[PDB]
Write a protein of this length. Sequence first.
Length: 327
Amino acid sequence: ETLNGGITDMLTELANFEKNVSQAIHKYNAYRKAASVIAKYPHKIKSGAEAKKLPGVGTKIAEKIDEFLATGKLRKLEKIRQDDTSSSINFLTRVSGIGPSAARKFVDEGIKTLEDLRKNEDKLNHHQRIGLKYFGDFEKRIPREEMLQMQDIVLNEVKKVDSEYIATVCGSFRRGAESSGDMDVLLTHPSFTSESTKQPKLLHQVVEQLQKVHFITDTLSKGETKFMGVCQLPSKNDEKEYPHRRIDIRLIPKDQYYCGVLYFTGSDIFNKNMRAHALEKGFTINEYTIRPLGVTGVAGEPLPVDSEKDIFDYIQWKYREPKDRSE
DNA sequence: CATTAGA
DNA sequence: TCTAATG
Ligand code: NA
Ligand code: NI
Ligand code: NI
């Protein structure tokens, strides 16, 4: 957590680069397990040789570790940091819609910057285009103050359309966060579950709703179970307009809400820990359900859930307010 | 880890 | 169809 920092950080710096600027899936894959295991080791790596005893640690990384340890740097680490092409790749990546593949592609073309990106707006797809348009807002944080306003509106229309609608704004927001990065909206309806062969319109209704009243302004990707867009708060009585903010709505079988609800609510660790618990308590938890464990090794049979409580009761745990779902 | 776009 | 990119 801190005695192997410099090792874990450089190593990750190492991993990410092969992953991105290079196409070395394995190397990359190599750098991460080590940085993973060099992470769990309870003592101060004092030498490569020392490290080396590790699993996944070979001659290459170890050699590396000696250099880092000896001198407070790595050349391999310094050259790349310096490298313009590689730089650029990391940057271009920042364009929502922009992935390593395309970032590499734009580069060879000579598209390095932001401006280079604009000047060839033609070269981008919708997504990337959108992203291009809202790069500054895109990167900005979401004050809960606003998260407050946002949610308001959204349950509003949701309701408006059909009163049978269940919207919940999940994630860090849900957990009290003073700030967020995009809103996540969990959506369900009775009239939609596990079997009941869809009702794409269900999602459909609501997205339309939001646009209709101007909350929704763009479309990043619209599917029959997963929308992904952008949004904006009606810029007041002037002098102050709201920054474009990402958005995502998702339909779900009413019979698997809460797990997902629970799940998407985190925290990652809260989840992981609770789930870990369910295991002892003879259960299995995941994003869509809750099945009791059969000694045979495993088992199935999704237990009925009506609320965040049910899952709790099941694994006979203390109800934890989302506030305190931190871990 | 699944959904969407896209070519 | 596969491959990319988001979450
Ligand atoms: Na990106
Ligand atoms: Ni368009
Ligand atoms: Ni979200």
